[PDB]
Scaffold this active site. Structure first.
Site, short mmCIF file in Angstrom:
data_model
loop_
_atom_site.label_atom_id
_atom_site.label_comp_id
_atom_site.label_asym_id
_atom_site.label_seq_id
_atom_site.Cartn_x
_atom_site.Cartn_y
_atom_site.Cartn_z
N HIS A 142 0.83 -1.20 0.00
CA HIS A 142 0.00 0.00 0.00
C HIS A 142 0.87 1.26 0.00
O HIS A 142 0.65 2.19 -0.78
CB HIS A 142 -0.93 -0.05 1.23
CG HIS A 142 -1.83 1.15 1.40
ND1 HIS A 142 -3.20 1.10 1.24
CD2 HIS A 142 -1.55 2.44 1.71
CE1 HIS A 142 -3.72 2.30 1.44
NE2 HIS A 142 -2.74 3.14 1.72
N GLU A 143 1.87 1.30 0.88
CA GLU A 143 2.72 2.48 0.98
C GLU A 143 3.56 2.67 -0.28
O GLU A 143 3.65 3.79 -0.80
CB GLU A 143 3.62 2.42 2.21
CG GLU A 143 2.91 2.18 3.56
CD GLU A 143 1.72 3.07 3.81
OE1 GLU A 143 1.66 4.19 3.24
OE2 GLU A 143 0.84 2.65 4.59
N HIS A 146 1.63 4.21 -3.10
CA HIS A 146 1.49 5.66 -3.11
C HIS A 146 2.59 6.32 -3.94
O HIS A 146 2.32 7.29 -4.65
CB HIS A 146 1.49 6.22 -1.68
CG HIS A 146 0.16 6.12 -0.99
ND1 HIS A 146 -1.00 6.64 -1.51
CD2 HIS A 146 -0.20 5.56 0.20
CE1 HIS A 146 -2.00 6.41 -0.67
NE2 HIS A 146 -1.55 5.76 0.39
N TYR A 157 -4.47 14.30 -3.15
CA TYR A 157 -4.88 13.53 -1.97
C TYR A 157 -6.04 14.17 -1.20
O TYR A 157 -5.96 14.45 0.00
CB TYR A 157 -3.68 13.29 -1.06
CG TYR A 157 -3.82 12.08 -0.16
CD1 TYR A 157 -3.99 10.81 -0.68
CD2 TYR A 157 -3.77 12.20 1.23
CE1 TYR A 157 -4.09 9.69 0.13
CE2 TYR A 157 -3.87 11.10 2.05
CZ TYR A 157 -4.03 9.84 1.50
OH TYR A 157 -4.11 8.76 2.35
N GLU A 166 -6.26 6.26 -2.63
CA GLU A 166 -6.31 5.26 -1.56
C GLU A 166 -6.69 3.89 -2.08
O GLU A 166 -6.07 2.88 -1.73
CB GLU A 166 -7.31 5.69 -0.48
CG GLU A 166 -6.67 6.52 0.60
CD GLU A 166 -5.53 5.76 1.23
OE1 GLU A 166 -5.76 4.61 1.68
OE2 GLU A 166 -4.37 6.26 1.21
N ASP A 226 -10.55 13.64 7.23
CA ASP A 226 -9.79 12.65 6.46
C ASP A 226 -9.60 13.11 5.01
O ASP A 226 -9.75 12.33 4.06
CB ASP A 226 -10.47 11.27 6.57
CG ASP A 226 -9.71 10.14 5.87
OD1 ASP A 226 -8.46 10.11 5.86
OD2 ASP A 226 -10.40 9.25 5.35
N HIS A 231 -9.92 7.71 3.03
CA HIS A 231 -9.87 6.34 3.54
C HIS A 231 -11.26 5.75 3.77
O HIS A 231 -11.37 4.61 4.24
CB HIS A 231 -9.07 6.26 4.85
CG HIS A 231 -7.63 6.65 4.72
ND1 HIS A 231 -7.16 7.92 5.00
CD2 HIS A 231 -6.54 5.92 4.36
CE1 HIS A 231 -5.86 7.97 4.79
NE2 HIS A 231 -5.45 6.77 4.41
C1 6MG Z 1 -2.74 0.43 5.12
C2 6MG Z 1 -2.85 1.14 6.48
C3 6MG Z 1 -2.44 0.23 7.64
C4 6MG Z 1 -1.99 2.42 6.48
C5 6MG Z 1 -2.53 3.54 5.59
N1 6MG Z 1 -1.55 4.62 5.58
P1 6MG Z 1 -1.56 5.82 4.44
O1 6MG Z 1 -2.88 5.75 3.68
O2 6MG Z 1 -0.38 5.74 3.51
C6 6MG Z 1 -1.27 7.37 5.36
N2 6MG Z 1 -0.72 8.31 4.41
C7 6MG Z 1 -0.97 9.70 4.53
O3 6MG Z 1 -1.77 10.14 5.35
O4 6MG Z 1 -0.33 10.47 3.53
C8 6MG Z 1 -0.45 11.91 3.66
C9 6MG Z 1 0.94 12.45 3.40
C10 6MG Z 1 1.92 12.31 4.36
C11 6MG Z 1 3.20 12.79 4.16
C12 6MG Z 1 3.52 13.41 2.96
C13 6MG Z 1 2.53 13.56 1.97
C14 6MG Z 1 1.25 13.08 2.18
C15 6MG Z 1 -3.87 4.01 6.13
O5 6MG Z 1 -4.94 3.57 5.72
N3 6MG Z 1 -3.82 4.96 7.13
C16 6MG Z 1 -5.03 5.52 7.72
C17 6MG Z 1 -5.62 4.68 8.87
C18 6MG Z 1 -4.58 4.31 9.87
C19 6MG Z 1 -6.81 5.45 9.55
C20 6MG Z 1 -7.53 4.58 10.56
C21 6MG Z 1 -7.79 5.92 8.48
C22 6MG Z 1 -6.27 6.70 10.35
ZN ZN Z 2 -2.84 5.15 1.81
#
Ligand code: 6MG
Ligand code: ZN
Ligand code: CA
Ligand code: CA
Ligand code: CA
Ligand code: CA
Length: 316
Positions: A142-143, A146, A157, A166, A226, A231
């Site tokens: 997933h990461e 991105h 985003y 997402e 969010d 998400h």
């Molecule tokens: C696959 C999963 C285990 C992890 C995933 N991380 P992600 O989608 O990858 C978070 N990513 C994020 O928030 O990116 C914004 C950004 C940050 C830094 C620079 C530029 C942009 C994710 O869904 N997180 C949200 C969950 C933890 C909730 C409960 C919605 C808070």
């Molecule tokens: Zn993500």
């Protein structure tokens, strides 16, 4: 670092033993030279300054508890690299073998993982909502996905483009999980989520509503949390992707499944040829239809199933 390629052995977050590609130069480093221009894994040492220090180990054995998140971030980045190269003929996230960098032990009690524009970053979790997040192959993929998105479609985003962003990461995270073929499913993050609750997950692609996420466009979140629900509204696209692959009848609309390999081909082509930074859900439908047309022909079952799946989730 300059050195010679070596093979270490260790245990991941879930206690499983695996070999890892390392580099020897005084220390053994988590630096895999066998893939592109390298995969590099760093210790953030519970701080938030990135990347931290390239992971160094005295003996090339990685069985300490502190080592486990690093083992898995490093190893699963390798699996994800292999998926993109072997399945899609894509060389790393930029298509030209960019070095892949990850940091583990980010912050304290950190219940998330992310791509920061330049590298992957994994919290350890607080032991209640998450254990160290690199323990999930779907999470790692997933990461890294991105980064693929950011170098290709560039989906902004927020709002619908962000929910597509997402979903793309959940879709390819799941397809990498199937590629490795160890306990694969259509759920997201189950291996590292809520160690005290068995059988749950962070999101479900087969039934997004099981965790409150919409499975039909008429149920989309329209608020501001969010980033406009990136998400949350991803559930609408995740459900469509699940239906394309596996089939089903959803809100009375029947979809003939075409399997996960064709799902992957269609969505990879859509992501890399047709989507743009501002694509919305309707534009994703059109991109997926065009991609399936390119690959399989306008009269094909594959095109018909893409249309049925988007119909089933209310996206025209
Ligand atoms: C696959 C999963 C285990 C992890 C995933 N991380 P992600 O989608 O990858 C978070 N990513 C994020 O928030 O990116 C914004 C950004 C940050 C830094 C620079 C530029 C942009 C994710 O869904 N997180 C949200 C969950 C933890 C909730 C409960 C919605 C808070
Ligand atoms: Zn993500
Ligand atoms: Ca050691
Ligand atoms: Ca699984
Ligand atoms: Ca999964
Ligand atoms: Ca759980």
């Amino acid at each position: 670092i300059t050195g010679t390629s070596t093979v270490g052995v260790g245990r991941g977050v879930l206690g499983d033993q695996k070999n890892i590609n390392t580099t020897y130069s005084t220390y053994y480093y988590l630096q895999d030279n066998t893939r592109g221009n390298g995969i590099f894994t760093y210790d953030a040492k519970y701080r938030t300054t990135l990347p931290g220090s390239l992971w160094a180990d005295a003996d090339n054995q990685f069985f300490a508890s502190y080592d486990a998140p690093a083992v898995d971030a490093h190893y699963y980045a390798g699996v994800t690299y292999d998926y993109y190269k072997n399945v899609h003929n894509r060389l790393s996230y930029d298509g030209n073998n960019a070095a892949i960098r990850s940091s583990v032990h980010y912050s304290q009690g950190y219940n998330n993982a992310f791509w920061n524009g330049s590298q992957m970053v994994y919290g350890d979790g607080d032991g209640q909502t998450f254990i160290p997040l690199s323990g999930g192959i779907d999470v790692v993929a997933h990461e890294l996905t991105h980064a693929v998105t950011d170098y290709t479609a560039g989906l902004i985003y927020q709002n619908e483009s962000g929910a597509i962003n997402e979903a793309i990461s959940d879709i390819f995270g799941t397809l990498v999980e199937f590629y490795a073929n160890k306990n694969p499913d259509w759920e997201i993050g189950e291996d590292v989520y809520t160690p005290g609750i068995s059988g749950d997950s962070l999101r479900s692609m087969s039934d997004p509503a099981k965790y409150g996420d919409p499975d039909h466009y008429s149920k989309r979140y329209t608020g501001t949390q969010d980033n406009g629900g990136v998400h949350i509204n991803s559930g609408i696209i995740n459900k469509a992707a699940y239906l394309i692959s596996q089939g089903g009848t959803h809100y009375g609309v029947s979809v003939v499944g075409i399997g996960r390999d064709k799902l992957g081909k269609i969505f990879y082509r859509a992501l890399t040829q047709y989507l743009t930074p501002t694509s919305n859900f309707s534009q994703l439908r059109a991109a997926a239809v065009q991609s399936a047309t390119d690959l399989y022909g306008s009269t094909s079952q594959e095109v018909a199933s893409v249309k049925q799946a988007f119909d089933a989730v209310g996206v025209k």
